[PDB]
Amino acid sequence: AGTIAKPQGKPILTISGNITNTNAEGAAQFDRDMLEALGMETVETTTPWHDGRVRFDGVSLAKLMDIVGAKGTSVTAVALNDYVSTIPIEDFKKFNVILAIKLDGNYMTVREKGPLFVIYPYDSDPELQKQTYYSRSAWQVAKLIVE
């Protein structure tokens, strides 16, 4: 039986891998309404890719790992362009990493590297202002695979 509700709209995120809570064969599929329903956090920061300080609204990745019952310690983020970013799951609770859904109050289209973007609060901690965390940021996210 499924433990995650089925999406009513077009799924924009699939979580798979070593998870226990699903709504499809070995996977948890989310439409945008389901992601927004998990609760939206706000992160304001300068970044290597944006002009000036920008504001992201998105869902806590720690909350996504909790609802799918992630059993791993690493997540592979798969982008639309088929390149991956590898992220230690420990980063999610340590730095309040979000799966961004909005940028400056607007949804993100494909040419803005949306609809989903893994974002760290770079300016909140000097530790996050370096390539280690810029490479763990993942734009055009389509999938999260728990290893």
Residues that bind Cl ion (CB under 5 A): 109-111
Residue 106 interacts with Na ion (CB under 5 A)? yes
Residues 6+ apart with CB under 8 A from 135: 85
Query: With contact defined as beta carbons under 8 Å apart, do 31 and 10 qualify?
Result: yes
Residue 82 vs 111, nearer CB to Cl ion: 111
- Residue number, 3 or 106, with CB nearest to Na ion: 106
What is the pattern of x (binds Na ion, CB under 5 A) and - over residues 110-139?
--x----------------------x--x-
43: left (phi over 0), alpha (psi -120 to 50) or beta: beta
In angstroms, give the least distance from the CB of 144 to Na ion.
Answer: 11
Query: 3-state DSSP: the chain helix, strand, coil percent, rounded to 5?
Result: 25, 35, 40
- Positions that interact with Na ion (CB under 5 A): 16, 26, 85, 106, 108, 112, 135, 138
